[PDB]
Design a protein around this ligand. Structure first.
Ligand code: CLA
Ligand code: CLA
Ligand code: CLA
Ligand code: CLA
Ligand code: CLA
Ligand code: CLA
Ligand code: CLA
Ligand SMILES: CC1=C(/C=C/C(C)=C/C=C/C(C)=C/C=C/C=C(C)/C=C/C=C(C)/C=C/C2=C(C)CCCC2(C)C)C(C)(C)CCC1
Ligand SMILES: CC1=C(/C=C/C(C)=C/C=C/C(C)=C/C=C/C=C(C)/C=C/C=C(C)/C=C/C2=C(C)CCCC2(C)C)C(C)(C)CCC1
Ligand SMILES: CC1=C(C/C=C(\C)CCC[C@H](C)CCC[C@H](C)CCCC(C)C)C(=O)c2ccccc2C1=O
Ligand SMILES: CC1=C(C/C=C(\C)CCC[C@H](C)CCC[C@H](C)CCCC(C)C)C(=O)c2ccccc2C1=O
Ligand code: SF4
Ligand code: SF4
Ligand code: SF4
Lengths: 143, 732, 75, 62, 31, 35, 96, 75, 75, 80
């Protein structure tokens, strides 16, 4: 995984339209793009609602939330055993490689990942909130 | 980001309508504010106390001004038993001509509201007679409120702002509050009663103009400083004394007659002056207990430190609790709320039975309204006390510092406490409900003689000890022994006259219905205490969620995992206990109201017959006394109870709307709002207008609170409308 | 009564009841009465199910008793 | 080999554990110097439905 | 005897001053 | 004279005017951007 | 390109990708008569400023409430302004 | 006969029917997914929630819609 | 039935009974519609049919129904 | 956003990671457990707070914990 995969203009799945697609948030704030390689043409379920047909080869799909993209990708991986990546696209026009964020699915341990938000202690060894009183602390968990 | 959560960045950056709601909600939670030091916390609390004290005094001044300006205080004073007090004029543009013609009561020439707060009887008893006196009082309290607002402003400036250690000075604060806030205040009130209220009760008006010229006693201060203090009790008021006149008026200013003034059915004003004097002496003495700046007095830390049981049954005793109480604002708040709620209950339970205000016992609607008021306030204050103690256990409790003291011991045997609370609650509810259902069935089956009617002989035996001669135990004051002989020198003739009279409510006769309802009350108190103590002791963690102290006082849940953790927080324990508190207080005030209504119609047999089974309460109390209330307005016009009918139905509405927030939960509503967002975004001519904050459903805790608030508001308003309308329809 | 009793299941949540069960289970374990089948609070779905079931039962049976008593007595 | 032998009943000392102050059979103890090597099996399930978890050497007693 | 109009308006002006002072206290609290 | 005048002015003042200004003002502040 | 077959993503055509479309708007510069436009420009000459509108509405609120409490309520013949003009009634226990 | 009270009560009936239909049809249509939870089909027909996240996801399952739906039906 | 209308009690009872049965059965119909939708619904066999298009504008249906519901209640 | 913390009782079973619907959690190499891997939460900004990780964590008490904090758009799970 030398570099993240770039985002081309690949064909989108066949869909008749729905009212569950992108709202104004895509225009003002952000929206997410899911791209996957399909082994064969098949009918999948849109996370917004309705049924769509994915095209053989690469597909591109823009969705409102990362959760929708990841739910659909997890469906593709667990049922159809496909591979896919997610991008975040801002209104300024800069995309952002999101899934898996390493080139390796997070459930598989991969070298080079650095532990973030790890407390090297058990849950009961957290101090009491009275000891961190009047301190800029989120809670006992962040000390 | 926005400016409204000035105290919360995390809410300022929130892009949804939850920002507004949580900035409203967390406004007064100063301890969780960004960049909040202890010094700023204490200074802001001090100035907020100044602020709402000024609010209290403005409320009192407003009551006085409205009674002076729009009320009928003089005329009411002329005929207290045949004049309905006036609260304030109504200027409602929505009134129709029948409403304007039906709300004109008293001698008003405009629509008015009939003051059911007892302020008329109170102000008449304290010597106020004319609208000018009430106006002067209102203006003075306006000045006092302005003074306290200026004091809050001044002590917020850096020169005058006090440090944390000034607040932490416990000894000086308690010395000054006991001696001066309590003691000297009681002395000054005694001086008022002796100089103004008693002379006004005996006919002569003593205002500031003739103050300093009319001696309150025929002898001056010679009996005082020569130690002949019994001269001030030489000639009390005659039994045939008319309040506010000189017929049968004595000269004694301080005495301990006891009982009630026969014409007003209220406490003798000389008794209440002597009472406040004795309190003043006791509290001025008490306020020299602690050591501040003069090398004498106790140290509270060392008092607690030296009280450790030698056998170790209590563990390390109270060692380490001084700093716990003093550094914990939530511990202090829970203690203050606990005490204040107990006091409010005591006021409810003592004002009905021992009315301190002239012509208050004869005005039944005011008595009922005051009892309901103070009991509901007390129940809420109690719920707050326990909630703040749970908050103390989360935020302010230090297990390392409190190691071995009674508090850590409470944590150690919390399961025993909760389990025995559950046992007593289960026993009380099983047996009380079973006896009520049994009595329901026996009445239903036409054999009321087979009811389990347990005579409450213990309470009756107390009453016999206290002078009641109905039951015939005749042990302590009803019998002839040393206790009664000692009592029969000063107080006991008046007390026995009061307690053995059928008219007053000093110690009402007790029956099996009173047994069953007091056990229902005990059920309610034990269950509410179960919920609240469970919340407080499991606040810091339980087996379902060991690390509950890391999530704060109020959080929604810990997810559906581990079986489900809905309503797991101590805040949620409070939220659940408020229902039981409302239920218990309603039981108590239903008992009060029905027993007193039976007394006031003169047929106490109705309650004594129908209070043993639930259908009797549903029929002869709720259904029976709701007739005139629901007929406040109807197709055949309306009367003066139409407002209370509307409020009755209003409270029903709020109660039901609360049920919506309590039963339906967030996630149905979130999806519904999502569809609504789509609709508004895709509607022509409406997409021109766009929300600044993203509309979202109410959060879980927020909606639990909103539903609880609606539940409680509808509860209180419905019952207030009922207790006032029924009592005024039957008695005015 | 059954309608008001349903309000218990409706207005509350599983976490509280589970902790109360923990205290009661402590009391049972104190006397060696601990059941082999571990006591558990109702599931959240079951709590809602019980709440709606008792609510419907109490409301409908109240209306049933009211209607039948009224219409039988008046005739 | 360190820690309790396999098959012995160990009293749990972790305060947050569901089986705190309860007894469970030792299944295995990891000798590779891991933080929680002691695998303890429990007759009764927790709220998550599991019957086992890992403990340190000072979180068990036999 | 009803309150004189001068009495009502004097008390109302005192109230207006009290309200000004309440605003000063509120602003000071908000800092 | 106070009794015949002041209610008819202050009831709309406190129940229509002051609410309107207060709600508008609070709205303008709450929606006011942080910067 | 956004216009390609089965392509609806374009970092150059961000507006079409995100759906920010003017559905019914029209950019025609003039629809009204010019002098009518001039009249209504002059009729709202000072009110085009938001704070001028704030002053207008504050003054209007004060004048409407004063006039309603002095003259408007009486003119509308509200029952509240009309006196009770009926004999009074006494509550139970002969309490007026 | 059918006077104004009959008009009002019949429009009430229609209101209450339409709300019950709202709840039930929302549960059926959003049984598999929503903008809040897209992966709701695999959570099952009868689950309590998806967690306190997303602001709180209580009573999202179509079963919970039948719960509220049942309530309004009763009403 | 003979002497049914004259017996007001049985007539009221039958009306109320069958109303409650009807409302319950409708709520169950919604529940089993949702159960089918979660469990037995296959997007492959429902591509552009009458059900899939309902699922593709459920937002419009629910928003219009909710609007209708609000309107009806308010009025 | 919310706060997600991983504690050293983690056995590296990956169930928290597989349960996460927003890809907040990932497995990293770690010598502390037998499996040789601990979870981590780099993309904490994407945590909606659904607490599926806590539901899927077998260790008693949980090795992954989610503490609800400041609510953002992503945390609120809004498509608008
Ligand atoms: C908190 C005490 C209090 C309360 C509850 C009331 C209640 C009422 N007053 Mg009274 N009033 C009060 C104090 C109070 N007043 C005081 C101290 C004065 C000055 C002497 C007045 C002078 C006054 C007049 C002259 C008139 C009323 C009128 C009214 C009625 C409604 C119109 C109105 O609100 O105008 C109130 C008018 C004001 C100018 C505001 C006065 C309020 C005080 C000074 C401040 C109270 C603020 C409060 C503590 C904190 C608010 C913050 C937040 C909780 C909202 C209503 C019965 C009118 C009436 O009878 O209509 C039928 C009427 O004509 N009031
Ligand atoms: C003689 C000295 C003195 C006096 C009078 C007071 C008085 C007061 N202090 Mg204290 N204080 C003092 C010295 C004193 N202080 C010292 C030396 C310090 C430094 C250590 C402080 C530090 C201090 C702090 C830190 C705070 C106060 C506060 C207060 C106010 C509390 C409100 C109150 O009175 O509730 C009303 C209470 C009573 C009148 C006594 C209660 C009696 C019971 C509950 C009721 C009995 C009532 C009775 C039966 C009649 C009721 C019915 C009748 C109305 C019909 C009060 C005005 C608080 C504040 O900020 O307010 C501005 C506060 O936060 N004080
Ligand atoms: C002297 C008394 C006192 C004091 C100083 C405090 C102070 C505090 N409490 Mg405590 N509390 C009290 C009494 C008190 N409370 C009582 C009596 C109760 C029981 C009801 C509670 C219950 C309680 C809970 C459960 C919690 C607090 C919390 C807090 C803190 C923050 C309050 C907040 O969130 O913002 C201010 C609160 C609000 C703006 C909400 C008020 C909403 C009300 C209920 C609406 C009422 C509607 C109205 C009456 C209807 C009008 C009539 C209708 C006809 C229209 C603060 C330390 C919270 C906290 O974080 O503690 C650290 C917390 O979780 N308290
Ligand atoms: C009328 C309504 C009602 C009733 C009866 C109860 C009853 C109870 N609540 Mg609940 N509760 C309610 C409303 C109600 N609550 C509401 C609306 C709230 C707000 C959410 C609460 C909140 C609440 C909390 C938070 C707590 C309670 C607790 C309790 C118990 C208190 C102990 C007691 O009285 O035991 C006596 C028990 C009863 C009266 C229950 C009914 C038992 C019946 C009579 C026996 C039936 C036998 C008969 C053969 C049945 C036939 C059925 C057949 C078809 C199978 C009890 C089980 C506390 C608890 O668990 O304490 C241990 C507790 O912690 N409740
Ligand atoms: C839609 C019908 C309707 C409306 C609009 C009103 C309106 C009014 N009535 Mg009428 N009334 C009605 C129906 C109605 N009534 C009916 C059916 C009855 C039964 C016959 C009555 C019986 C009646 C009586 C007996 C009296 C009134 C009075 C009043 C006035 C209250 C004075 C005021 O504004 O105080 C200011 C408003 C309040 C104090 C309300 C506070 C409530 C809020 C929600 C509390 C929480 C506040 C919170 C902090 C948020 C604030 C936001 C704020 C910034 C905007 C007002 C003109 C009173 C009056 O004229 O006295 C002057 C009076 O005494 N009415
Ligand atoms: C609590 C304060 C309060 C007060 C003082 C009023 C006052 C009034 N309301 Mg009510 N109202 C209130 C609260 C209040 N409302 C609330 C909270 C609600 C929601 C439930 C309502 C709902 C309501 C309805 C639905 C209606 C009224 C109507 C009226 C008007 C009756 C006049 C009349 O007989 O028709 C004669 C009417 C006229 C001659 C026209 C008068 C037009 C002027 C411009 C009004 C002046 C009012 C005010 C002083 C200035 C603006 C204040 C503020 C916006 C800045 C009167 C001005 C009725 C009406 O006709 O009002 C438009 C009516 O239909 N109100
Ligand atoms: C009496 C109690 C009550 C009330 C008023 C409501 C009201 C509502 N519910 Mg709730 N609900 C309740 C109890 C209640 N529910 C209970 C106990 C349950 C069981 C859990 C539910 C379950 C529930 C669900 C599951 C759903 C609803 C829905 C609705 C809405 C239906 C639309 C409607 O009524 O038109 C509009 C609202 C009303 C008519 C409410 C009364 C308002 C009156 C007319 C006042 C009008 C304005 C007034 C003058 C105030 C302005 C002045 C003021 C500022 C002073 C509405 C918000 C549905 C919904 O939201 O979709 C539409 C829905 O899906 N509710
Ligand atoms: C949670 C918590 C809290 C709170 C708590 C509470 C709220 C409690 C309450 C409590 C209470 C509320 C109590 C009460 C009590 C009472 C008492 C204790 C009483 C007594 C009495 C007596 C002793 C009497 C005697 C007598 C008689 C019998 C009669 C006559 C006279 C004489 C005197 C002889 C705190 C903060 C603290 C801490 C933390 C936690
Ligand atoms: C011109 C004129 C007029 C009018 C007048 C007026 C308008 C007056 C007024 C006056 C006023 C208008 C007064 C007021 C007062 C007020 C007050 C006195 C208030 C107070 C408040 C408070 C005290 C509060 C506090 C607080 C809060 C609650 C919040 C925050 C915190 C604090 C604490 C700050 C008329 C038309 C009639 C006639 C002609 C002439
Ligand atoms: C009805 C309802 C909603 C929908 C309610 C919406 C989101 C809020 C409605 C607010 C509007 C703006 C009307 C508010 C009317 C109030 C009288 C205004 C109070 C404002 C104060 C700040 C003064 C929920 O989001 C919810 C969530 C969890 C459990 C139960 C429920 C629930 O029952
Ligand atoms: C009361 C209550 C409980 C507690 C109820 C307990 C767990 C179960 C109810 C008691 C039954 C009766 C226990 C079964 C008893 C055995 C069958 C024993 C034989 C009976 C002999 C006594 C005769 C919840 O678990 C709950 C969960 C979610 C929302 C609301 C609630 C809720 O309101
Ligand atoms: S509250 Fe709703 S969401 Fe949070 S746990 Fe209980 S059920 Fe699941
Ligand atoms: S956190 Fe719980 S689930 Fe995620 S890996 Fe560590 S142990 Fe397995
Ligand atoms: S909460 Fe939901 S999102 Fe945040 S980590 Fe746990 S699972 Fe992934």
């Amino acid at each position: 995984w030398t570099a993240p995969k770039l985002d081309p203009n690949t064909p989108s799945p066949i869909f008749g339209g729905s009212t569950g697609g992108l709202l104004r948030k895509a225009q003002v704030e952000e929206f997410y793009v899911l791209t996957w390689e399909a082994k064969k043409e098949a009918i999948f379920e849109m996370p917004t609602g309705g049924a769509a047909i994915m095209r053989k080869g690469p597909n591109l799909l823009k969705l409102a939330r990362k959760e929708q993209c990841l739910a659909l990708l997890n469906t593709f991986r667990s049922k159809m055993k496909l591979d896919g990546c997610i991008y975040r696209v801002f209104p300024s026009g800069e995309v952002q490689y999101l899934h898996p964020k390493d080139g390796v699915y997070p459930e598989k341990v991969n070298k080079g990942r650095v532990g973030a938000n790890q407390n090297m202690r058990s849950i009961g060894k957290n101090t009491n909130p009275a000891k961190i009183k009047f301190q800029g602390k989120l809670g006992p968990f962040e000390v | 980001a926005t400016k409204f959560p000035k105290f919360s960045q995390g809410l300022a950056s929130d892009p949804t309508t939850r920002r507004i709601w949580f900035g409203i909600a967390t406004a007064h939670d100063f301890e969780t504010h960004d960049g909040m030091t202890e010094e700023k916390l204490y200074q802001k609390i001090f100035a907020s106390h100044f602020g709402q004290l000024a609010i209290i005094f403005l409320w009192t001044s407003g009551n006085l001004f409205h009674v002076a300006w729009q009320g009928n205080f003089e005329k009411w004073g002329e005929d207290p038993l045949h004049v309905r007090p006036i609260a304030h004029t109504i200027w409602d543009p929505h009134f129709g001509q029948p409403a304007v013609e039906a709300f004109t009561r008293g001698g008003a020439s405009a629509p008015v509201n009939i003051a059911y707060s007892g302020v008329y009887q109170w102000w008449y008893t304290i010597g106020m007679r004319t609208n000018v006196d009430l106006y002067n009082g209102s203006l003075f309290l306006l000045f006092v409120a302005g003074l306290f607002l200026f004091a809050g402003w001044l002590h917020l400036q850096p020169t005058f702002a006090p440090a944390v250690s000034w607040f932490k000075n416990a000894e000086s604060r308690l010395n000054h509050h006991l001696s001066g806030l309590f003691g000297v205040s009681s002395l000054a009130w005694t001086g008022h009663l002796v100089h103004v209220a008693i002379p006004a009760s005996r006919g002569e008006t003593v205002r500031w103009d003739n103050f300093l010229t009319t001696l309150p006693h025929p002898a001056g201060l010679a009996p005082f400083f020569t130690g002949q203090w019994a001269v001030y009790a030489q000639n009390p008021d005659t039994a045939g004394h008319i309040f506010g006149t000189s017929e049968g008026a004595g000269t004694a200013i301080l005495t301990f007659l006891g009982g009630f003034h026969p014409q007003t059915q209220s406490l003798w004003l000389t008794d209440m002056a002597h009472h406040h004097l004795a309190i003043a002496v006791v509290f001025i003495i008490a306020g020299h207990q602690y050591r501040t700046n003069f090398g004498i007095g106790h140290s509270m830390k060392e008092i607690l430190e030296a009280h450790t049981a030698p056998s170790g049954r209590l563990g390390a005793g109270h060692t380490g609790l001084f700093d716990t109480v003093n550094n914990s604002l939530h511990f202090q708040l829970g203690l203050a709320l606990a005490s204040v709620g107990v006091l409010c209950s005591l006021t409810a339970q003592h004002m009905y039975s021992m009315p301190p205000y002239a012509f208050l016992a004869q005005d039944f609607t005011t008595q009922a309204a005051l009892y309901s008021h103070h009991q509901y306030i007390a129940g809420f204050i109690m719920c707050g006390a326990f909630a703040h103690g749970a908050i103390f256990f989360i935020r302010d409790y230090d297990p390392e510092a409190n190691k071995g003291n009674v508090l850590a011991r409470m944590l150690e045997h919390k399961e025993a406490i909760i389990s025995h609370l559950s046992w007593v609650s289960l026993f009380l509810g099983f047996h009380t409900l079973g006896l009520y259902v049994h009595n329901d069935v026996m009445q239903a089956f036409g054999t009321p003689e087979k009811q389990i009617l347990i005579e409450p002989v213990f309470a009756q035996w107390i009453q016999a000890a206290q002078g009641k001669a109905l039951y015939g135990f005749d042990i302590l004051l009803s019998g002839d022994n040393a206790a009664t002989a000692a009592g029969n020198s000063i107080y006991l003739p008046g007390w026995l006259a009061g307690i053995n009279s059928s008219t007053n409510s000093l110690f009402l006769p007790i029956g099996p219905g009173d047994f069953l309802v007091h056990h229902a009350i005990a059920l309610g108190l034990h269950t509410t205490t179960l919920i609240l103590v469970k919340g407080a002791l499991d606040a810091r963690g339980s087996k379902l969620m060991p690390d509950k102290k890391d999530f704060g006082y109020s959080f929604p849940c810990d997810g559906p995992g581990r079986g489900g953790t809905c309503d797991i927080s101590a805040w949620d324990a409070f939220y659940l206990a408020v229902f039981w508190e409302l239920n218990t207080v309603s039981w108590t005030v239903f008992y009060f109201h029905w027993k007193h209504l039976a007394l006031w119609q003169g047929n106490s047999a109705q309650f004594d017959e129908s209070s043993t089974y639930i259908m009797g309460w549903l029929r002869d109390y709720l259904w029976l006394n709701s007739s005139q209330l629901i007929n406040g307005y109807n197709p055949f016009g309306m009367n003066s109870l139409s407002v209370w009918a509307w409020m009755f139905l209003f409270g029903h509405l709020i109660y039901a709307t609360g049920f919506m927030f309590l039963i339906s939960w967030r996630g149905y509503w979130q999806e519904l709002i999502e569809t609504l967002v789509w609709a508004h975004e895709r509607t022509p001519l409406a997409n021109f207008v766009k929300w600044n904050d993203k509309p979202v459903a109410l959060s879980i805790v927020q909606a639990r609170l909103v539903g609880l608030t609606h539940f409680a508001v509808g509860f209180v308003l419905t019952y207030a409308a009922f207790v006032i309308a029924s009592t005024s329809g039957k008695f005015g | 009564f059954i309608w008001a009793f349903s309000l218990m299941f409706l207005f509350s949540g599983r976490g509280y009841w589970q902790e109360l069960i923990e205290s009661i289970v402590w009391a049972h374990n104190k006397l060696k009465v601990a059941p082999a089948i571990q006591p558990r609070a109702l599931s959240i779905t079951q709590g809602r199910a019980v709440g709606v079931a008792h609510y419907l039962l109490g409301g409908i049976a109240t209306t049933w008793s009211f209607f039948l008593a009224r219409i039988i007595a008046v005739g | 080999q360190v820690g309790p032998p396999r098959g012995t009943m160990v009293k749990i000392l972790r305060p947050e554990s569901y089986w705190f102050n309860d007894y469970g059979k030792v299944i295995s103890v990891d000798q590779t110097g891991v933080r929680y090597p002691v695998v303890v099996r429990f007759e009764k399930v927790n709220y998550a439905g599991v019957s086992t978890n890992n403990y340190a050497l000072d979180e068990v007693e036999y | 005897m009803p309150l004189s109009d001068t009495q009502v308006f004097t008390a109302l002006f005192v109230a207006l001053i009290t309200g000004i002072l309440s605003l000063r206290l509120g602003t000071q609290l908000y800092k | 004279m106070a009794a015949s005048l002041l209610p008819s002015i202050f009831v709309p003042l406190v129940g229509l005017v002051f609410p309107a200004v207060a709600m508008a003002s609070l709205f303008l502040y709450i929606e006011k951007e942080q910067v | 390109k956004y216009g390609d077959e089965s392509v609806y993503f374009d970092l150059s055509d961000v507006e079409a990708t995100t759906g920010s479309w003017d559905v019914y708007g029209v950019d025609s510069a003039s629809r009204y008569p010019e002098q009518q436009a001039a009249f209504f420009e002059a009729a709202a000459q000072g009110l085009g400023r938001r704070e001028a509108v704030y002053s207008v509405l504050a003054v209007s609120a004060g004048l409407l409430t004063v006039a309603y409490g002095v003259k408007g309520a009486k003119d509308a013949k509200l029952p509240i302004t009309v006196g009770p003009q009926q004999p009074a009634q006494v509550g139970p226990r002969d309490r007026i | 006969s059918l006077g104004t009270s009959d008009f009002m009560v019949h429009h009430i009936h229609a209101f209450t029917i339409h709300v019950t239909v709202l709840i039930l049809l929302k549960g059926v249509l959003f049984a598999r997914s929503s903008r809040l939870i897209p992966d709701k089909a695999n959570l099952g027909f009868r689950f309590p929630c998806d967690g306190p996240g997303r602001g709180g996801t209580c009573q999202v399952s179509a079963w919970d819609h039948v719960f509220l739906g049942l309530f309004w039906m009763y009403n | 039935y003979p002497y049914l209308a004259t017996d007001y009690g049985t007539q009221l009872s039958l009306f109320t009974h069958h109303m409650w049965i009807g409302g319950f059965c409708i709520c169950g119909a919604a529940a089993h519609a949702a159960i089918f939708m979660v469990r037995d619904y296959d997007p492959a066999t429902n591509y552009n049919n009458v059900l899939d298009r309902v699922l593709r504008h459920r937002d419009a249906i629910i928003s219009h129904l909710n609007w209708v519901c609000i309107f009806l209640g308010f009025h | 956003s919310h706060a997600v913390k991983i504690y050293d009782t983690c056995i590296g079973c990956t169930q928290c990671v597989r349960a996460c619907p927003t890809d907040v959690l990932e497995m990293v190499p770690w010598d502390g457990c037998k499996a040789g891997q601990i979870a981590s939460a780099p993309r904490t900004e994407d945590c909606v707070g659904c607490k599926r990780c806590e539901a899927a964590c077998p260790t008693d008490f949980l090795s992954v914990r989610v503490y609800l904090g400041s609510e953002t758009t992503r945390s609120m799970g809004l498509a608008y």
